């Protein structure tokens, strides 16, 4: 099952939080109505290149509702040290700095 990328803006509903596994859980609210759609999610150390680091734990993160302001959670496996959590694509993408150690 596949979906096209979500096109609208995301917002963090709360501070990203370390899980007991050392991973990071993130909850986002989605302003769009094109759901169901694929949530763009990655981590990077360099926002200019967006070269991926770490990986997404959540297999196929999706917004499942077609109504605005629905929420979803995703889990990320951040790299050693400092990185950025990057949700969404384009100019309206959101970022949050993360430190793992």
């Amino acid at each position: 099952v596949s979906y096209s990328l979500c096109t609208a803006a995301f917002t963090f509903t709360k501070i990203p939080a370390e899980t007991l596994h050392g991973t990071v859980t993130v909850e986002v609210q989605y302003a769009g109505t094109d759901g169901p759609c694929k949530v763009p999610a990655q981590m990077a150390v360099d926002m200019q290149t967006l070269t991926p680091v770490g990986r997404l734990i959540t297999a196929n993160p999706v917004i499942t509702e077609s109504t605005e302001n629905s929420k979803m959670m995703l889990e990320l496996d951040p790299p050693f040290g400092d990185s950025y959590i990057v949700i969404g694509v384009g100019e309206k993408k959101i970022t949050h700095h993360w430190h793992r150690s």
Partner: single-chain antibody
Amino acid sequence: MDIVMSQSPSSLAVSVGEKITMSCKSSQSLLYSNNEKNYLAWYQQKPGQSPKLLIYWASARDSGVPDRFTGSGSGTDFTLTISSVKAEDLAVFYCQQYYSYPYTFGGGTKLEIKGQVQLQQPGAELLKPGASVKLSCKASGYSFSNYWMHWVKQRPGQGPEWIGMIHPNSGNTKYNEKFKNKATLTVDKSSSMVYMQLSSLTSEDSAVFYCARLGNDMDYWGQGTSVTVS
């Protein structure tokens, strides 16, 4: 496992006005499923100049790049098309993957014709085997602190090699394993200066060393410092 970039043909001799195609193949897919982008760039290096970004995200043209340059392809197979060659296009064209660290470049296609951001680097050094040298990179025209500064090594007419990068604000670094004991990156935040110290110099180190802000719509290269080891 490092990604290997392969280009063909090694050289292309064409007359002005011809349409040409050149190929770039990666050993691993550069299509990142999370955001559906191809992390592939095309660089043009004219005589006497630093490499200049032409295409990023496999098909996005950088500002000022004419429509007659077209990047295409996806995954592991990419193509740069020049619809109508001009004499000024004479250059070596390099593809580069930025899907994974370390960044890697192809061996280049040499195009032969028959028919405010500043990164300032000093002039040539010449040194003896066993010595060390501290190369400098003076940055201006942008907010220095938050942009990664990369260092690149290029032997004559050969594929560039990504040495590593340093973030000035945090001092964080990422090194290519092949240079982890050869190069040391530091910054002087008070002077917007980036340094790369090369140790235990040998003739294998003789090359032009570039500092560069790499990637997408903010790609900028210094003029390079030529280092020759006796």
